[PDB]
Design a binder for this molecule. Structure first.
Ligand SMILES: [Cl-]
Ligand code: NA
Lengths: 420, 423, 424
């Protein structure tokens, strides 16, 4: 019994998409046994830096006074200003409501005290079980930063993430701030020299290889500015060339590059203070061509890089593009991006990741994105259906599996939580 | 109470949008007592520069011969070329038809001579009353250029605008043509020197302050090229730093920057001769960061600048972004811009202004833009209702008021014409 | 006769007008069937279009070297298996292959690639051209004619003329972008260009242009240009354009077609599938339009990020005709946004699409896919003016549709289509 109309296709696709367990291959979450660095609950949702930026456009409260408030005072203020005093129509505010609803709380009542009561009853481990189930996420990739004292501790103590959580080695401080990070590496025993000589090359490689051994990361990642260039006679250029790319190749680990972030244009806003610019594609093109035995995962921040990044993926099979990152993570842009991407790459890409910083965001990030992606799929399958092609439900489930999970694991050359 | 259908939602949003009096916070209209610089009528609509550009793509008539023609002849040619010989499907041509319809004229007859008869029967003051009612526009912000001899006369004679019309001081000749303009300032008794010294600084400030006192402007405005940078050692860079910003901070008057116009790439087209380019955001970013006690209003001309402008608005609360300017003022682009803005800023922006150069254009500019903005709001409300939120009709009316009027007045730190009459 | 009473009735009228209108496809890589094997056709050529080579290389374990070592049939088999069977053929290029097979009466439901092949084995080139132009509703095809390609050159030198449905367009990439290498061939052909760019060099390059203009009767002369294109420029390209091409173009009243934004061979092993894109400066195009008002220019651009500003540049200059959704733009999401921006700012005074077809049958999908998108843009735009009180008539719809799909081009180039050249 064939799928022979758009109407039935819409049912089968929406269901296949809803039922597919997601691998979220870039997040800011942590296994619950790491302790308090895992953020969760309605106050954390309301104080997400996305909503700090937004509240500051309305409130008379100074940013100084805001940071001096408690977490609950901050959440109260953002609730009042973004939900009660104006309708919560932005993507970030909507996402808070999608989360409350998904947990079985009722946004109709606007009863924040009662929302808070739900979270006070649970342990972190319970809420992870709840959220992963509700979000239908089988596997989460963490962002693991050896230079963050608060996170390093857990690794140093012999803690392992539970099997649903995977490590990814974040290298920004090493690559973008080597002149400072130099001295931390020396204090940790990595005997880097003032000169970029064989000794410094071998000791930075050892630092990388030691952390790879300890975390077993799925990839190594870096955020890069719009002015990113390669090759480059800079600390960043030399490290990529001489240390990171050879180690990534040896271990068959992809190098993830998140390009286009301009750091701290409004420092007082903290995490809400970063900006965006369009990047040259030249450095990415060079890396792909001149390092055919390295694998690259790339996502870019500027709307204006998105089409050319898709074309670049047509050129190089060692590029996997992923996600609608940050300022790209808004319905209007997710839609145009996913359509361009599918049109020129078919199913050979990773449409989305959450970048979740608070546990419950998995619910809204995946619900909001799946609905858009489902609709793109329905359009694209219908177009071939009307061309005379038979699409089977098995084939849909396969394609959707590729998009939400298998493409990633196939590219990184490892197995998920269920397969292992 | 709460809404729970998309039927009922669409209705309530569309009615709220239609019923909300608009503040049009950037136009090229004037109070009717200013005389003939207020353009109106069907011949003015048809010879708007947007349509001169379009007709020049089709007609065998040279641009020279076109400017040699009378207004009625130009209008006649444009009607034949763009409406009769091809269907009037462009946004500008569509707009002409929306105006005629809104006035109660029937575009079905295509009877241009009959449309003309309507306008011959009325005064400027009558037509302004008619159009502001039909467009539901309560407040119009003008573009007032003290370097235009025609306009400067009225201000200097002591004419004050009708309470529905507000001043905005346009400074392009000062900031962008100082090499010529410095000599006019001198001729007006402002003792600017050849060097940029303390004397020149204080005299340019005095010019600004005299015009602020004369016009009571709601903001000071400049149009800027794609190559705009700040800081910069240039005439413009020094006037902004030394004169404009301190004067604007002292009086608490925003600085409006309309960025991305490349002037006169086709000189023979006149007003239709200007082009566009993408700007760097660096100068705007620097201004917002380093001048936190100044308020900035910004609109940009390049499609490729729109998303990063929204992000910049997320960084800086002294930034208010506004409108879909000029080449952006097209349904396809109004739609994508309004959606991005709302997704990232909620209701903390000004979605639209008209740039109306001819009075009747307020009808189409607002009717076309309101319909798109209403669609966007319905979608965003529907998304939060789907998430369990209950929207009330009063909350809708409030959101709509913010977007079409109150956001502007709150930002510029003044009252509109009705609140002024009350306060 | 009757008013258009509803959007539903509008839609059927527009879709009918669009479907019935014979297309002039003003830029293709097809040839008149009498040119011989250089006209590519059949399912194996469809499947090995370089768009699909790019896509199969993202999936398959087969090396690019091993791929090129395979026969055409083997290549087609791999591509079918990897992009149609192992994953759903949802990409625009893949979908296009299915639209083609369907259009020819070959049923994609069966996936019977061997039976599809049998269809093509039964026919001549000339029979397939008749079939495909009828099914695609294409009246007139404009070729890309390169005098430097020996494989094509031969047909011209043999005194062969294109079938009257096929029109010549003179491609000048090797002369303009590779002059220092091409000089030597010019000299072999008796064009005695000098080491210096002096009068003799100017006159001999002009003579080469004039010779080919007279041989091919081209409707325009064409070049593809990188994102770093500038004019004026003290380069071989800049000098040839200024001193030879613009003067000859003006004398003969032939437009100059520029396809801007291709970055050649960023992945050389992929061959034709190895080219990339960048955003260009508009300055060179602006300068040419302004400073050469007696020349006509046809422009299409490769970067998404140039599209809006190109439409604005058309508003400025009546000697600019913009055309098409080129290559990486030739994707429904992008065709839609482009056609909407264009019509919003230019009305009907542009050429919405061309196919760039490299394999004969692509005319079918390229025009079927594009016509559906353009029909829907037209429906939206007519509906908006009907809602403003304007009475659009069916005859006016057909007129506007004739303008967009054929007449705008023939009017701009100052020449007649095949049917009009028979009558005259
Ligand atoms: Cl751009
Ligand atoms: Na769009």
């Amino acid at each position: 019994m064939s799928i022979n109309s758009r109407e039935v296709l819409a049912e089968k696709v929406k269901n296949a998409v809803n039922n597919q367990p997601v691998t979220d291959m870039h997040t800011h979450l942590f296994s619950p046994n790491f302790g308090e660095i895992l953020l969760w609950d309605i106050d954390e949702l309301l104080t997400y830096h996305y909503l700090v930026a937004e509240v500051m456009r309305w409130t008379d409260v100074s940013i100084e006074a805001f940071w001096a408030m408690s977490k609950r005072e901050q959440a109260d203020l953002i609730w009042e200003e973004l939900f009660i005093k104006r309708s919560p129509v932005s993507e970030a505010c909507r996402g808070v409501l999608t989360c409350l609803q998904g947990l079985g709380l009722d946004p109709a009542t606007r009863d924040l005290q009662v929302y808070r009561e739900y979270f006070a009853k649970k342990t972190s481990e319970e809420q992870v079980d709840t959220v992963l189930q509700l979000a239908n996420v089988s596997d989460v990739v963490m962002t693991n930063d050896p230079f963050d004292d608060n996170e390093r501790i857990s690794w140093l103590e012999g803690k392992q993430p539970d099997s649903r959580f995977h490590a990814a080695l974040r290298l920004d401080p090493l690559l973008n701030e080597y002149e400072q990070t130099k001295h931390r590496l020396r204090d940790w025993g990595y005997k880097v020299n003032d000169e970029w000589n064989e000794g410094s090359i071998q000791e930075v490689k050892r630092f990388l290889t030691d952390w790879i051994e300890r975390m077993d990361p799925v990839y190594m990642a870096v955020s890069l500015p719009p002015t990113f260039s390669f090759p480059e006679e800079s600390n960043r250029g030399r490290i990529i060339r001489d240390c990171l790319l050879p180690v990534a190749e040896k271990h068959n680990i992809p190098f993830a590059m998140m390009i286009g972030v301009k750091k701290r244009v409004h420092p007082a806003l903290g995490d809400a203070g970063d900006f965006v610019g369009k990047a040259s594609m030249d450095g990415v093109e060079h890396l792909l061509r001149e390092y055919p035995n390295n694998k690259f995962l790339v996502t870019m921040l500027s709307r204006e890089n998105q089409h050319e990044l898709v074309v670049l993926a047509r050129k190089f099979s060692n590029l996997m593009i992923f996600g609608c990152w940050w300022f790209m993570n808004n319905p209007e842009i997710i839609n145009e991006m996913t359509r361009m991407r599918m049109e020129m790459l078919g199913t050979s890409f990773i449409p989305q990741h959450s970048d979740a910083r608070v546990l419950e965001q998995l619910i809204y990030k995946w619900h909001h994105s799946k609905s858009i992606i489902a609709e793109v799929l329905i359009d694209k399958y219908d177009d071939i259906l009307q061309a005379g092609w038979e699409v089977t439900e098995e084939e849909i489930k396969r394609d959707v599996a590729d998009l939400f999970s298998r493409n990633f694991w196939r590219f990184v050359g490892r197995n998920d939580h269920v397969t292992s």
